Structures are given as C-alpha cells and as structure tokens.
C-alpha cells in the first residue's frame, strides 16, 4: 500500500567538515523519485535534492544526493555549522506521498562557556503585580547546563522556566534563558536575586546577581 | 523564493478553518499545490493536492476526509479547509507548489493553527534593559520580555530588522497562567548604548497587536 520511507540516523551529531551522509530507504520501488529538503529552526523548508541526485540551484553544492538500489542518501561533503538542520527525504513515485521520519542535524564543536547576564524585572512590569526575573546563559557549548535560582541566599524552586535556543547557525552554540517569576509583593520583600550557572566550560559556578535595593545596576 | 500564506490562526476544537496559499507574482502557470502538516517538534505529513488547472485533488486517507482543497483559478490561490477540529489539528500547514519537471520547487512559511476553547491575548512587552549586570567586557546583553500571549506566535524583530546580528529570540514557554512567554536578546557593543537606540518590534497577530518597545539603559 502506502511507501514507507525510513530514514537513517534519526540524529546525526557530527564535527564540523566532517563528510555526513542521510539514508533513506523506500518500502517500494520509487524509481529514483525521491526528494531531499532541509528544515531550518525558524521553520523554513527548503528543496534540496530532487529526482534523487538533482541538486536545487540555490543549495551549495556540498550537498549531493544517491542512489544505491533501494538505498538513496544525502551527503555534505563537508559539514558546515549552517547545516544544522532538520533534515527529510519525500518520496514522490506514488501516493499518498510519505516522507522519512528525519534526520536532526547536530554540530560537535569545542566546549565554549556561556556568558552569564541577569536583568531585574522592569519598573512597567512591577506595576502590573509580577515580576519576571531574567537570567541569560549566551553562547556556550554543550547544552548541557545548571541553573539555579537564590533570593537572599535561598535556593528557588518551582518559580522559574526555561528556554534554549537550537544550535546557532554560525557559531553552532546554545543559548539559555532562565526566568523567575514572582508576585510583586514578593519580588519587594526580597534583596539580592542571584542566578547560579553552572557548565562543563566553567570550572566553578558563575554567580551573577543584583540588588533590588540598587534598582539592579549601581545606585 | 518562497509563496504567501495566511497568518496564524486560533480556533475552537469542532469548528473549521481555512488558509490559503499563493504564489508572490500573478506567474499564471499551471502549478499543481502540495499541502503539508506538521505538529509542534514532529515529522512532515501529506496532506493532499489542489491542482487549479483542472480542479483535480488528492487527499491522504489518513485526514479521514476532514481536509478539503479549493482553489481560485483567478487569483491563483489554494485554500485548504480543515473541518470538525481538535487539537490534533493544532499544528504548522506548509503548502508547496511543484510540477512534474520542478517538483516542490518553493514553499510558503507556513500557516500556525491553535485549536483551543481559550481566547486570544495580546502580549505585554517589558524591556531587558542593559546595565551592568548584562554586560561582559565591551558587551552589553539586552532584550525584551514579551509575556503573556495566546496562542502562539508572537514574531520579534530588533530594530525593525536592521538588527539581526548576535540575536537570540526563545521558544516560547507555556505557563502554568495557560499563556505564552519569551524572550528576546540581542547582544551589541556597550559602547553604543549612549548612542544606538534599540527596539524591539513584536507583533502577535492573532490579537492583532502591535508594539515597539524601545529598551533603555
Ligand atoms: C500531471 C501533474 O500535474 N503531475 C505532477 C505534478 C507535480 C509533481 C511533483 P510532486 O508534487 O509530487 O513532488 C513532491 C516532491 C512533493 C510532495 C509534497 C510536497 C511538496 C513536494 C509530479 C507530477
């Protein structure tokens, strides 16, 4: 009935400049019908290869695209950091048309530690009734990161959330942010609001604080 | 290259909607339309086909007939219409036009539908502002707090797009409030705080709100 398309690996983590290669293999005979597209974080699809080795004339020609009998694939002869990706081949011999499950491109790159910004909540905010305490890990690799959050040296709980950012397409980093949230009431019962990060780049945990008192720069 | 659809799109579970998809320029040429489905993080999914020349259509059995494709030979523009709505339908509609000798040559941004009962909400937008607890050797980090929003998406811009560099915009988080929140920071040099004005452009269509918020020192 329906073509099954399975693709291989379902991630692929990679150095960068390495040779990669994507596998789709048809449960059917596709006759070279096969179609490569990539899809970019913000979601952007684009064509890549066609008709199994026809490259899209905007795509560089890094990539390639195969066929080994059932066996069709996408190669990047060189991995670059933009190339971090989403990645699914769409068979289109028949239909319905399918498409592979995927393949998440990731980039192996050095250890980079993050640069640590806090960011006290906003006078505008305050007169709203909450107060959204911003901590920033910028630019660091691997994602792998602790954050933790301390109102006058007492470890928070429950009261914060966090958000990271896919690998950066020029410098394949992560980003972090940590958000603590408090009522107002409580954001001005309290002092020092400090933002404890800790990662494989920093040999000691990065403390970064502010006084309430002090608005939150040096008064 | 890419083609024009609708914008995102809040509805409620067991009605119906439908967006639309059109090439850029009047290119009156016999296109035929794929439409594509995508939930949050997951796999692509065909949906069906239009083809406007004849008004032939092709739909994947698994959407059980609830999909239906029409189009407007005058203007060129596919509609797919989703009908009896749940939240499995709450997902990103790609559209792509192709031919036989130029099979998904382009494809449209994609349309955002949130099927929820919840209203729509236009976000707050509080600045993160730069000090000197946002700044690291000459680099200062700034941004804007763009909280409670529904449904998603709010799209953010710096400078009205004239800042693009060392931008990080967050995946919205969803609160316990039931309501969205991001975050967006771009990092530029300290020394242009005094002189460099920076504002952030957030729109959230589905509220039909606009703001530009300047971020100050
Ligand atoms: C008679 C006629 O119009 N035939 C015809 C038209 C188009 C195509 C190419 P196609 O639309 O099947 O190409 C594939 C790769 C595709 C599937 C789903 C979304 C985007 C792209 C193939 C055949």
């Not at chain 1, 560089?60 to 081949?89: M, N, V």
Request: hydrophobic share 30%; aromatic share 10%.
């Amino acid at each position: 009935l329906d073509i099954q398309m399975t693709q291989s690996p379902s991630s692929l983590s990679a150095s960068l400049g390495e040779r990669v290669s994507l596998t789709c293999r048809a449960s059917q005979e596709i006759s070279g019908y096969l179609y490569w597209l990539q899809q970019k974080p913000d979601g952007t699809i684009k064509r890549l290869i066609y008709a199994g080795s026809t490259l899209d004339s905007g795509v560089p020609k890094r990539f390639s695209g195969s066929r080994s009998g059932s066996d069709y694939s996408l190669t990047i002869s060189s991995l670059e950091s933009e190339d971090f990706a989403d990645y699914y081949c769409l068979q289109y011999a028949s239909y319905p048309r399918t498409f592979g499950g995927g393949t998440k491109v990731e980039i192996k790159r050095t250890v980079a530690a993050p640069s640590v910004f806090i960011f006290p909540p906003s006078d505008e905010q305050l007169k709203s009734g909450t107060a959204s305490v911003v901590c920033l890990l910028n630019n660091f690799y691997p994602r792998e990161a602790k954050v933790q959050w301390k109102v006058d040296n007492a470890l928070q709980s429950g009261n914060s959330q966090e958000s990271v950012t896919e690998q950066d397409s020029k410098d394949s980093t992560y980003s972090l942010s940590s958000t603590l949230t408090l009522s107002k009431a409580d954001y001005e019962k309290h002092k020092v609001y400090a933002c404890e990060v800790t990662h494989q780049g920093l040999s000691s945990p990065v403390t970064k604080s502010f006084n309430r008192g002090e608005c939150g720069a040096g008064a | 290259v890419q083609l024009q659809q609708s914008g995102p799109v809040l509805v409620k579970p067991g009605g119906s909607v439908k967006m639309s998809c059109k090439a850029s320029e009047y290119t009156l040429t016999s296109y035929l339309f794929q439409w594509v489905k995508q939930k949050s993080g997951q796999g692509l999914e065909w949906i069906g086909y239009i083809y406007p020349y004849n008004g032939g259509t092709r739909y994947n059995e698994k959407f059980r007939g609830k999909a239906t494709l029409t189009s407007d030979k005058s203007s060129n523009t596919a509609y797919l219409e989703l009908s009896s709505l749940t939240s499995e339908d709450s997902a990103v509609y790609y559209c792509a036009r192709s031919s036989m000798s130029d099979p998904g040559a382009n494809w449209g941004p994609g349309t955002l539908v949130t099927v929820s009962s919840a209203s729509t909400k236009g976000p707050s937008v509080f600045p993160l502002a730069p000090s000197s607890k946002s700044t690291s050797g000459g680099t200062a980090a700034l941004g804007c707090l763009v909280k409670d929003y529904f449904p998603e998406p709010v799209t953010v811009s710096w400078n009205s797009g004239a800042l693009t560099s060392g931008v990080h915009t967050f995946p919205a988080v969803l609160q316990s409030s039931g309501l969205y929140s991001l975050s967006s920071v771009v990092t530029v040099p300290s020394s242009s705080l005094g002189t460099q004005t920076y504002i952030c452009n957030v729109n959230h269509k589905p509220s039909n709100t606009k703001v530009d918020k300047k971020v100050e020192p």
